[model samples]
Target chain A: NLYFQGMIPLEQGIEFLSVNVEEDSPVVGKKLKDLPLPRDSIIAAIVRGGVLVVPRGDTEILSGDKLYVIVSAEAKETVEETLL
Target chain B: NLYFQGMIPLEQGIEFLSVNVEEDSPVVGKKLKDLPLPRDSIIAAIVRGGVLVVPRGDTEILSGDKLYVIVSAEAKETVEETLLG
Candidate 1:
């Protein structure tokens, strides 16, 4: 069964920041590993064309895709800048 | 209560490889970032001094730590080598 709940902090320094890849965004067409990302940060999941994307190093970003990223609070801003 | 179960395959290419860190292990005394591990591999947990160690970027390996690692079938070798080579 599917379950849902409002988000809460699991650790003091951990959080999720979701984003939408837009037209002309720098990330489009770039493989995940090629993108400048912070160490210890993970691009946990991606939603594209109504299907779930199980992220891997070979996965590339597409415009309009929704990215679910997990990062420390300290790395959030840089992550947003990379996506949009 | 604690529980245990026999190991079983979950996904075809997904697996776990456990190892004991010996004193001379290349991984001993090294921080997580220093090890050249496969991009897709993850050190799932570390059992050290009979307690669970919370792994993070700065976590260091100690002699006798038992590592529970998660990696793709192809990366299993890479994980083992990184811990002991």
Candidate 2:
């Protein structure tokens, strides 16, 4: 079963956020591997021009891209604050 | 290391949405396990009044709570439409 006993439950301090990249955002024009993102955060995907892109280290982020990110609960605010 | 070869990459069809439950929403006040959510969707967490709650099957959802959900790509719109007005 998908729902099973002993499976890890969603815990506090873990968060998922969809963030829109602004023209002036530090991450814009930078490659995924170049950003100084938090250790506990992962950029899951990039939505650009209505297309979902699986990000790679060499993937370039652009202005107006929507980043789907999974982040640790403690680092959520920091991640958003840094990216947005 | 967290970044390893052959680990699943973030696929295109999967999505994560943060939804705010409304007062008239069908899911408000219902137990987590009772809602007829999409088969590919999972309610990851519920945020209420600045508190993060790890939901159990018996956990009750309330109005204004924000639900963090991980859903399959095909079911994203359906899940959001069903849960929100």
Can you give the DockQ of every candidate in the order shown? 0.06, 0.03
- Writing each residue's lDDT as its tens digit, candidate 1 over B19-85 gives 7889999999999868888875777556565454546668999999877665666777878888898
- How many steric clashes between backbone atoms does each model show? 0, 2
Q: Tell me the tens digit of each residue's lDDT in model 2 across B1-85.
A: 1211111223456555578888999888789889787766667656677565656679999999878776667877788887885
Candidate 1: residue B64 lDDT (0-100): 94
Cα lDDT, model 2, residue A42: 69
The native-contact fractions of the candidates, in order shown, are 0.00, 0.00
TM-score of 1: 0.48
Off by over 4 Å in 1: A1-84, B1-8
Write down the lDDT of every candidate, Cα atoms only: 0.65, 0.67
True contacts kept of 2: 0.00
